[PDB]
Design a protein around this ligand. Structure first.
Ligand SMILES: O=C(O)c1cccc(COc2cc(C(=O)O)ccc2-c2nn(C(=O)c3c(Cl)cccc3C(F)(F)F)c3ccc(Cl)cc23)c1
Ligand SMILES: O=C(O)c1cccc(COc2cc(C(=O)O)ccc2-c2nn(C(=O)c3c(Cl)cccc3C(F)(F)F)c3ccc(Cl)cc23)c1
Lengths: 261, 256
């Protein structure tokens, strides 16, 4: 059966590469400097202004709001990328349609956070498919509640990146998150746990072979699902406070529908 | 790291201490709950009158709260004594010992409270009593809905069918979490947990060989514990702003 898990691992790796614009391997080359050309750096107001005329941005008057909304609309794309990737997990599309929607609804936040770490180091985050790099200093120093909305993401990423996972590890881990049988309102939990039981076996085997000197990394990576749940819940508490205080965040109602999460 | 026979030695050490540290084992809890026993049989409290009769045998919502609290404090004492036997714990920096306990006792109390529960109620008074979920859930003000989440967790956790020899290692793994806030030396804590995790993995493989990926499923329960402990502390705060009950100093320090 071991070679079936390696086949599942490779299948997920291959699909992961097709689904997401910027892999972690490629992000690491950019971030470390062992890379091709150099990304545009946003480190203060003026450099943001020039970058807009340079790289494609996910936003479209105050600066902190625009950066916030850029994070949201980039998340809207990541949802579609994750949704396409989920369809390639063996067994997923045969699940009850309402269950597929439920798993995605409750999993995209944990996966976005997870994959955002691939694009971050302690000093900043890649944006616009790696062509830009926005610094932690600038993001953290944004006004009112936006500064303190950005910084928790880096604090998570820095801890998570200490596990030193590569894309072949992450392709299976992401699948494990999606196939969580404890999401509220699932109709048929059994086939979801059956699939997740397979992915877990594959994650375990992948980690033992790809990180043979990293003891109990499997266990440590599952413990990171504690950090993911925590931060997604406080994330939601943060969005509420922003929405109940900021009515200078007026968008066209159609855009508001699009990002309603 | 370890040879398999050292891990089995570690499992037995922890099971043995667990038995010495905790009054009411899960095996004894299941013997009382499932029944078929004329001697181990509990008095059942399901309403006000049976609560009045239970006092002679073995405000109402507050008195039950104080019953839960006094037992939690004893639980903290028992967990602390058990922690002292986990190899390496007492050799850790003294502030880290406090830190690990401060953040681990709530997750463990919840874990071990499940052992005393079924879907219909909870053992009390070292097993001599049994208070029903229905009665607890129906308490007034904020206390009814403070009781029910414990049952909601217990039913899910007990579906794993762990016995005490599994739980002894699981409890140790929780205590030795290197990701607790404010630890000074995470590495020695992680070396110990790597050993405890290796021991848990082997214990579950041998004691539940037909239960695939139980190790992973049990670790995913440490996620549920983090959420519920947080909701617990948030509920206690709201209750404190209406009820002037008071808390034991041991619990008082832990929640600061
Ligand atoms: O294009 C621009 O203008 C832009 C400007 C700033 C940052 C980014 C890149 O941001 C991301 C890229 C990717 C990616 O490419 O894989 C994924 C996520 C983010 C990102 N989501 N997020 C959130 O709050 C968030 C999260 Cl974590 C999860 C779910 C939903 C959201 C929300 F919808 F609410 F946003 C961030 C907060 C801080 C930072 Cl620093 C980054 C993110 C792009
Ligand atoms: O003596 C009576 O009258 C009595 C009547 C009902 C139940 C119990 C037994 O309860 C427990 C026994 C044991 C044990 O035996 O090891 C352990 C825990 C509880 C228990 N703690 N708790 C809490 O809110 C709590 C918790 Cl989880 C953790 C830390 C602090 C507290 C707090 F201090 F705030 F209470 C409960 C809530 C509901 C239920 Cl059902 C049980 C508990 C005794």
């Amino acid at each position: 059966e071991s070679a079936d898990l390696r086949a599942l691992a490779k299948h997920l790796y291959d699909s992961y590469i097709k689904s997401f614009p910027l892999t972690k391997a490629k992000a690491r080359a950019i971030l470390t400097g062992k890379t091709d050309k150099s990304p545009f750096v946003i480190y203060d107001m003026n450099s943001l202004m020039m970058g807009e005329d340079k790289i494609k941005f996910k936003h479209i008057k105050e600066v902190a709001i625009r950066i916030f909304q850029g994070c949201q609309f980039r998340s809207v794309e990541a949802v579609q990328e994750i949704t396409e990737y989920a369809k390639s997990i063996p067994g997923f599309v045969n699940l009850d349609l309402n269950d597929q929607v439920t798993l995605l609804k409750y999993g995209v936040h944990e996966i976005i956070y997870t994959m955002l770490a691939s694009l971050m180091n302690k000093d900043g985050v890649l944006i616009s498919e790696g062509q830009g790099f926005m610094t932690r200093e600038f993001l953290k120093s944004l006004r009112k509640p936006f500064g303190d909305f950005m910084e928790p993401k880096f604090e998570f990423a820095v801890k998570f990146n200490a596990l030193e996972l590569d894309d072949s590890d992450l392709a299976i881990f992401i699948a494990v998150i999606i196939l969580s049988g404890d999401r509220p309102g699932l109709l048929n939990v059994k086939p979801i746990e059956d699939i997740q039981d397979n992915l877990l076996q594959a994650l375990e085997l992948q980690l033992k072979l790809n990180h043979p000197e990293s003891s109990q990394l499997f266990a440590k990576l599952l413990q990171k699902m504690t950090d993911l749940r925590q931060i997604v819940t406080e994330h939601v508490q943060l969005l509420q406070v922003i929405k109940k205080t900021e009515t200078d965040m007026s968008l066209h109602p159609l855009l508001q529908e699009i990002y309603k999460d």
